[PDB]
């Protein structure tokens, strides 16, 4: 499964993490492909640069 970030990779391994943007696009990213750090997305509303 591929998510919608500019420079994304399709990992498809056992367990991979995703983030939803709360800045408007409501699309899913992988934490690594949209430059999210786990702590940040689980702490604050995550707003991709596209919605920023």
């Amino acid at each position: 499964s591929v998510c919608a970030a500019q420079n994304c990779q399709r990992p498809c391994k056992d367990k991979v993490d995703w983030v939803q943007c709360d800045g408007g696009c409501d699309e899913w990213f992988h934490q690594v492909c949209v430059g999210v750090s786990p702590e940040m997305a689980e702490n604050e509303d995550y707003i991709c640069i596209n919605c920023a």
């Binding site: 056992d14 367990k15 983030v19 899913w28 604050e44």
Partner: peptide, 9 residues
């Protein structure tokens, strides 16, 4: 945010 983890294979 809204997070998730998809488990494959």
């Amino acid at each position: 945010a809204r997070t998730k983890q998809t488990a494959r294979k």
